[PDB]
A paper describes a structure:
Rab proteins, the biggest subfamily within the superfamily of small GTPases, are major regulators of vesicular trafficking in eukaryotic cells. One such family of effector proteins that was reported to link Rab proteins and the cytoskeleton is the Mical (molecules interacting with CasL) family. In this publication, we present a thorough biochemical and structural analysis of a Rab effector domain termed bivalent Mical/EHBP Rab binding (bMERB) domain. The results show that the domains probably constitute a Rab8-effector family involved in endosomal trafficking, and the Rab-binding specificity can be well explained from the 3-dimensional structures of complexes determined in this work.
Residue numbers in the entry:
A (entry chain A): 1841 to 1880, 1891 to 1983
B (entry chain B): 1843 to 1938, 1951 to 1983
Write the structure that this text describes.
Amino acid sequence: KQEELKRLHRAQIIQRQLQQVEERQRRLEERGVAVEKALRPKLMQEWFKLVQEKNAMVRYESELMIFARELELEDRQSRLQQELRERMAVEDHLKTEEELSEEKQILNEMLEVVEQRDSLVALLEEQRLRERE
Amino acid sequence: EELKRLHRAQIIQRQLQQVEERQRRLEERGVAVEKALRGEAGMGKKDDPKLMQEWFKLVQEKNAMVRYESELMIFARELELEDRQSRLQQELRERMSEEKQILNEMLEVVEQRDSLVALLEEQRLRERE
């Protein structure tokens, strides 16, 4: 329960930031429309700045996507781990051939959740080492 | 792959080295600017508002580097844990006794990684605000 609360809070923080990003992109969309309507000097210069600012927001949105997926995966993993801890309260000799292979299937699900998670951390690592430009 | 992971580790060790050096250069500019602020480098310098301005830019640039150093720390630990995890998983996916203990070591490694991701998230979502 204390594990699951620190997670809900991180999810809200992320939502709140995606909402702020959406809105900042909405303002840039409108300035962008006005600048392009004005293309019937300083005006061409504004168009390039808007492109930069939209780019920045997209990079920020991307990071939030990654964090939000990683968070979904922590949740799935935690639940699979619960399903597995429950099954391991019973000694192994007291289980069927079938019961034992469901334990092995749960464990595979959990390992491929972990693999996806590590793949998203590697991508985020790449992005943070690339943003030092 | 163990060599993907190796390569990512070398990248990180090398970026920490570039960071340590960028901080060394900033230490030196910082020392010169402060010698100039105490009127020791040129009798005009101390009156120039560009000089006070440099001091504040150095502080910002030092702060940026420390944020970067922090991120590299986290990534490097995470990477060690990814390595440990993948090896414990390999040990386990070979065996299928100490089988139940290996699984527990791996679940603790997974929990520590969750925890470093959460810390990284907190810091990245505080560099904005």
